[PDB]
Symmetry: D3
Subunit: 92 residues, 6 copies
């Protein structure tokens, strides 16, 4: 019970603050779905092109799965930073 | 006309690809609105607390405007990386 | 009371988990002190060298205050990522 | 001998500067130990929960090992940036 | 034809702008070659030292391939950010 | 003399290693010049458009100076990471 009191820097949050944090989290869920959809597109693109070496080489050179992972991490850490701006912990 | 042909690594894109890129951009617009709303909350919070030194010191120590800017940059660069995964330029 | 239940993805945490999170936060406090000490060194270095244009130009070109801010942000976001690995939210 | 003279932008450093850089490196060693401890916790958590599919799915969805790696990289690059603020190379 | 008009925020670009963007891309190609050369050095270093456990352990602890990948990503995203400063999309 | 021995994790470097590190630094100097050129373009663009509010608003919304600074930092930290892959310090 009341885990936050045990965590350093955590402070009490009002309903407005919690609602804003949850708004950020919800938008992120939409990004997650978009990322899954892009991953699904990539899976199809790769499959459609196996045996067509030129396209497989082009896709390997574009590295789209690596870039999608980069984007996912930036989206998640940006969400965390916005939420920190709302929640405002009293610690480094 | 056809600026992309002049830009290195840029390739022709199908309507499905362009639609996915635009989907990413649209979700980002929603993030922009959320960020503005958080900035507006912060402006109000600061204003409501001027002359209450303890709260002004607490807010200064939490640095919420800096964290909001950090989050904005991560959201934008993540969008760029997801869009690169869709668009797949043929260059470093 | 029990703010975490209202925040999406947040889950109950055991004492061991909270103790590890707090360990991360404590180490960060040590980094904060080190960063302040470096900022103090920089303030002195700059002061000692005003009127010695060559050194002031060299310091301006090294941009040490900007680099210290870069380091501070990376330390804080790394702390946040380690703490997320311990706390393990059930959301994007 | 005197490798630094051969490296562009590297400049001579006083004992105080070297001591501060080493202070940063030492604090980092403490972070390394903490990261290993978290990795050990994660290994145990996973092991304790194999055959309990719901928990294994939850852990896979939280991606704590990926987040721990993210945190490690941010800690290391932040250390590098703080050390650059102390050492102040005369190059881009 | 004219894919840019279909992509949100994309604007018409003059020849000077496109030439600057391509200048960035070209410099990046030079970085790609340097990165390949470093990867080749690492491959040789590892090979030359197999059976010399102490050196293999030292290399594993330095993690140079991971650091090279980190550097590659930072170079590519920095290129993207400079190009965005030139191209100036009218969107988030 | 021999400052590196006093810095933790620093190891002796061969001429080939130092030459590769310097190659990275040199390429970076080329990036610095390109960044200055882009900054100069931006200064001119802004100047040419003062009193044309629509263009000044568009430029303010694109935030090209902020994006150029983002790119500069990513280029510099990527250089640092590549150089760490060559130099291979024996510390966290
Ligand atoms: N002042 C204050 N009071 C709070 O109650 C509170 N709760 C969170 N925060 C801070 O918000 C910011 C963003 O949170 P996010 O959920 O994105 O990341 C969180 C989330 O991924 C995870 N986490 C924290 N608590 C829990 C929890 N109870 N369950 C699951 N995951 C958790 O660990 C990350 C980092 O936490 P901190 O980096 O220590 O504090 C956070 C951070 O500064 C708070 N700040
Ligand atoms: N002016 C100046 N004089 C110096 O003697 C000096 N030594 C280091 N630095 C700069 O400090 C900053 C942080 O150093 P860190 O050790 O975290 O990263 C270092 C470290 O990981 C690695 N490295 C450099 N020299 C060695 C070395 N001799 N042995 C092992 N690793 C080394 O390569 C990284 C990047 O070096 P640079 O990015 O070229 O210069 C560094 C950087 O700006 C110096 N700056
Ligand atoms: N205003 C404007 N008009 C343009 O014509 C234009 N073209 C690109 N940009 C923006 O430049 C910046 C850097 O571009 P880079 O090529 O590094 O990344 C690009 C590139 O990796 C990829 N991409 C975009 N279009 C194509 C394309 N036609 N073919 C291949 N890859 C493409 O997707 C990345 C992100 O694009 P955005 O993040 O939506 O817009 C870019 C970005 O802001 C433009 N901005």
């Amino acid at each position: 019970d009341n885990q936050h009191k045990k965590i350093k820097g955590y402070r009490d949050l009002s309903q407005e603050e919690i609602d804003m944090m949850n708004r950020v989290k919800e938008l992120g869920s939409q990004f997650e779905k978009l990322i899954q959809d892009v991953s699904d597109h990539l899976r199809g693109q790769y499959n459609a092109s196996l045996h067509n070496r030129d396209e497989i080489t082009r896709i390997a050179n574009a590295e789209p799965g690596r870039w999608l992972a980069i984007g996912k991490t930036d989206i998640q850490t940006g969400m965390m930073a916005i939420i920190r701006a709302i929640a405002q912990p009293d610690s480094f």
